[PDB]
C-alpha cells in the first residue's frame, strides 16, 4: 500500500463541522450554530473520530478586486480551529464551500473574474498554511456546478472543473514549503458518482501526475428513500443496490488503481428537513449497510453534521442509538431486524410474537430489559434467526390501556451494536373532522401509540394529487407532518399550492400496518376535513 493510501486510511472515520464557517451570512454563527469551542473539537476526537472536515464559505469575508483579501478576524478564527484540530492529532480537510454556487458557478459568463477570485483565495490559503502539518489537506471546491444551458451537465462544465482543479493544484504546489507535498483533494462534478464524472476526475488526476492526490465524492442515499417519498419508507433492495453499484464503480475507477477515495459527505437527504423523516430502525439499517460496504471498499468516510447529530451545547449526541450504530459499524457488521418496533394491540389477547432477525454473520447471545437479562424459554425463544417473544413476557412488560412504548427489549449479540426493540402498545389510530385555511391546516389525530410512515393523496377520480404528481405517496415533512406532542397531522401550504379545487382522498400509512382514510374538500384558500 502506498503512502497516500495509508494517509487516507488513517483518516477513518471523519466528521464534518457543518453549517459552521460554511454558513452564508455575516459569520459562522449565521445559521444557528455557536462559535467553535476547543471542547467541540476535543469531543469529536474523544468520540473516536480521526479526521475533521471544515467547510468554509469565503465570499462574504472577501475584500474587493484585485486582492480580495480575506477578513483577518474570520481567517484567524478558521486557522485557530484548524490548529486545535491538529493539536488533537486529527487530520483536517479545508475547502471553498458555498462559493461554488454563490460565485464559482458563473464561469461560462464571467470567466476572468471567477478565475481571479479563485486564484486570490487559494493564494491566501496556500500562504497562510504554508508551514502547517501534512495532516492538513486542501480540497479545491465543494460540489462544483455550473450555469445550465443544455441540462445540468455539459462538456464546457467538465472543462471548467478541470481548469479549476488544475489552477488550484499549481497554486498550492508553487507555494512551496509543506504545500509541496500537501495532500490535495479533488471533486468529481457535483461530487456525484456517474461513471463519466468518475472518468473525467480520473483523467484530470492522470494529467496532474502527482502521488499526493485524493478523489472525493458525496453520497446521501437512493433519493426516494432518503427523503421518504414514492412509498420508499423502508430500507429495501433498491436502496441497497444503489449503494452497492455506486461504490463498486467508485472502487473500480479509483481505489482499484492507486487513487484513494474520501466520501467527503454522507448522510440522508431527508435530514435537511429532520431526523424524524426516516423511521429509526430503517435509518440504522441504512447506515449499517452503507458503512459495511464502504469498509469493504476502503472508502474513508466523513459524516455530514450541520448541528443536528452532536448537540454542540452539551457535547453529546442527540441520538445515542444512531451514533452507537455508526461506532459499531466502524469495526464490523451489526445484527439488525425487520423492524425496531414490536406492536401489540391493546384489548386483544396477547400472544407469542415472531420477529425476523438479520444476523449479518453475528449471533444472538441474550435479551435484556432495564439491564436485566430475560429468561430463555420462559420469556423468549430463538429458531434459527427468528426471535419469538413469549406471551407472558409481553404481558408482564406491558400495561393495559397505556398506549405507546411500554418497554424496550435489548437484543445482544456476540459482535456489533445492541438492537433495541420498542414494545408499542397500540390501538387503531383515529382522525377527526376539521375546518381551516390552506396555510394553517391540521387534522386532529389520535395516534394511539402508532406512528405515521407515509401518506397517499389522490383526487376523487383516482388521479395523483399534490407535489411529485408521478406518485401517490407524498414526501414526508414537505407535504405533511405528524406532530405527536400536539396530537395532530399538519398539511402544509406547499401541498395545497399544488392541488386543484376538488375532493382529495388521503391515505395515512402507519408502521403498525394500519391505514386510515381521510377526505379533504379544497376550495380557494379553505379546506374541510372529513374523517
Q: What is the 3-state secondary structure (H, E, C) of 463-482?
A: CECCCCCCCCEECECCCEEE
3 state SS of 273:
coil
* H/E stretch holding 198: helix 195-208
CB 474 within 8 A of CB 456: yes
Sign of CA dihedral 37, 41, 42, 46: positive
Give the method used: X-ray
Tell the residue number behind the cell numbers 487516507, with chain if given: 8
d(CA 23, CA 96): 12
d(CA 440, CA 527): 10
- Give the number of other CB atoms < 10 A from CB of residue 176: 11
Residues across the chain: 531
CB 121 within 8 A of CB 164: no
d(CA 87, CA 44): 13
- Cell numbers describing residue 315: 457535547
d(CA 249, CA 291): 16
Helix/strand/coil (H/E/C) assignment for every residue in 53-65: EECCCCHHHECCC
Q: Which of 28, 88, 143, 282 is catalytic?
A: 143
Report the Cα 106 to chain-centroid distance in Å: 28
Q: Which of 431, 443, 435 is nearest to 522 (CA)?
A: 435
So where are the chain's domains? 1-333, 334-427, 428-531
Interhelix angle 195-208/155-175, nearest 10 degrees: 30
d(CA 474, CA 506): 10
- Cα–Cα–Cα angle for 416, 298, 7, nearest 5°? 115
CB 93 within 8 A of CB 49: no
d(CA 302, CA 264): 5
Expressed in Å, this structure's resolution amounts to: 2.3
Tell the residue number behind the cell numbers 423523516, with chain if given: 277
**How does DSSP assign 330-395, residue by residue?**
HHS---EES-SEEEEETTS----EEEEEE-TT--EEEEEETTEEPPBTTTEEEETTEEEE-HHHHH
**CA-CA distances (angstroms) from residue 287 to 267, 291, 326, 417, 423?**
8, 6, 7, 12, 23
Long-range contacts of 496-500 (CB under 8 A, 24+ apart): 496/438, 496/439, 496/441, 496/522, 496/527, 497/438, 498/466, 498/467, 499/457, 499/465, 499/466, 500/459, 500/465
Q: Which of 109, 112, 156, 119 is nearest to 140 (CA)?
A: 119
d(CA 448, CA 85): 47
288 an active-site residue?
A: no
**Do the bridges between strand 441-446 and strand 430-431 make them parallel or antiparallel, or are there none, so unpaired?**
antiparallel
Alpha helices by DSSP H, listed for 209-297, are 223-226, 237-250, 280-296
Say which CATH class 1-333 falls into: alpha beta
Per the DSSP assignment, residues forming a β-bridge with 186 are 215
402 an active-site residue?
A: no
- Cell numbers describing residue 301: 468516510
CB 310 within 8 A of CB 316: yes
3 state SS of 325:
helix
Rg (CA), the chain: 26
Q: Which of 190, 265, 282, 288 is catalytic?
A: 265
Amino acid at each position: 500500500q502506498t503512502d497516500i493510501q495509508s494517509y487516507v486510511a488513517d483518516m477513518q472515520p471523519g466528521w464534518n463541522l457543518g453549517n459552521t464557517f460554511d454558513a452564508v451570512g455575516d459569520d459562522e454563527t449565521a445559521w444557528g450554530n455557536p462559535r467553535v469551542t476547543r471542547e467541540l473539537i476535543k469531543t469529536i476526537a474523544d468520540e473516536g473520530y480521526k479526521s475533521i472536515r471544515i467547510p468554509v464559505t469565503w465570499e462574504n469575508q472577501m475584500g474587493n478586486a484585485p486582492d480580495y483579501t480575506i477578513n483577518e478576524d474570520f481567517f484567524s478564527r478558521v486557522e485557530q480551529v484548524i490548529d486545535w484540530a491538529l493539536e488533537e492529532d486529527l487530520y483536517v480537510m479545508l475547502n471553498l464551500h458555498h462559493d461554488s454556487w454563490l460565485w464559482i458557478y458563473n464561469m461560462e459568463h464571467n470567466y476572468d473574474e471567477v478565475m481571479a477570485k479563485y486564484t486570490a483565495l487559494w493564494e491566501q490559503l496556500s500562504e497562510r498554511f504554508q508551514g502547517h502539518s501534512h495532516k492538513l489537506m486542501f480540497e479545491s471546491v465543494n460540489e462544483p456546478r455550473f450555469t445550465r444551458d443544455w441540462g445540468e451537465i455539459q462538456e464546457n462544465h467538465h472543462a471548467f472543473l478541470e481548469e479549476l482543479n488544475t489552477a488550484f493544484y499549481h497554486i498550492v504546489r508553487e507555494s512551496g514549503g509543506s504545500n509541496t507535498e500537501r495532500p490535495l483533494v479533488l471533486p468529481t462534478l457535483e461530487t456525484a458518482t456517474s461513471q463519466d464524472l468518475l472518468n473525467r476526475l480520473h483523467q484530470t488526476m492522470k494529467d496532474l501526475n502527482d502521488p499526493n492526490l485524493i478523489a472525493t465524492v458525496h453520497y446521501y442515499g437512493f433519493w426516494p428513500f432518503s427523503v421518504n417519498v414514492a412509498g420508499y419508507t423502508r430500507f429495501e433492495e433498491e436502496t441497497q443496490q444503489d449503494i452497492i453499484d455506486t461504490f463498486n464503480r467508485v472502487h473500480n475507477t479509483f481505489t482499484a488503481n492507486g487513487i484513494p477515495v474520501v466520501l467527503g459527505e454522507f448522510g440522508l437527504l431527508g435530514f435537511d428537513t429532520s431526523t424524524d423523516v426516516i423511521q429509526q430502525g430503517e435509518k440504522l439499517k441504512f447506515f449499517e449497510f452503507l458503512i459495511h460496504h464502504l469498509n469493504e471498499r476502503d472508502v474513508t468516510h466523513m459524516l455530514w453534521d450541520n448541528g443536528q447529530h452532536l448537540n454542540r451545547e452539551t457535547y453529546s449526541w442527540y441520538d445515542q442509538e444512531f451514533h452507537n450504530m455508526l461506532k459499531a459499524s466502524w469495526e464490523g457488521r451489526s445484527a439488525t431486524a425487520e423492524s425496531n418496533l414490536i406492536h401489540v394491540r391493546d384489548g386483544e389477547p396477547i400472544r407469542d410474537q415472531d420477529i425476523q432477525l438479520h444476523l449479518h454473520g453475528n449471533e444472538l447471545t441474550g435479551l435484556q430489559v432495564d439491564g436485566d437479562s430475560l429468561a430463555l424459554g420462559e420469556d423468549y425463544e430463538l429458531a434459527g434467526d427468528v426471535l419469538t417473544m413469549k406471551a407472558d413476557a409481553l404481558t408482564a412488560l406491558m400495561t393495559p390501556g397505556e398506549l405507546g412504548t411500554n418497554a424496550v427489549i435489548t437484543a445482544q449479540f456476540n459482535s456489533g451494536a445492541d438492537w433495541h426493540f420498542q414494545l408499542q402498545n397500540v390501538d387503531e389510530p383515529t382522525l377527526e373532522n376539521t375546518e381551516g385555511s390552506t396555510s394553517n391546516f391540521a387534522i386532529p389525530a389520535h395516534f394511539n401509540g402508532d406512528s405515521v410512515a407515509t401518506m397517499e393523496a389522490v383526487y376523487a377520480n383516482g388521479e395523483f394529487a399534490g407535489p411529485q404528481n408521478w406518485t401517490s405517496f407524498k414526501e414526508f415533512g414537505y407535504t405533511f407532518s405528524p406532530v405527536y406532542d400536539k396530537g395532530e397531522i399538519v398539511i402544509t401550504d406547499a401541498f395545497f399550492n399544488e392541488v386543484r379545487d376538488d375532493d382529495i382522498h388521503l391515505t395515512f400509512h402507519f408502521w403498525s400496518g394500519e391505514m386510515v382514510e381521510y377526505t379533504l374538500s379544497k376550495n380557494g384558500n379553505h379546506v374541510q376535513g372529513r374523517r
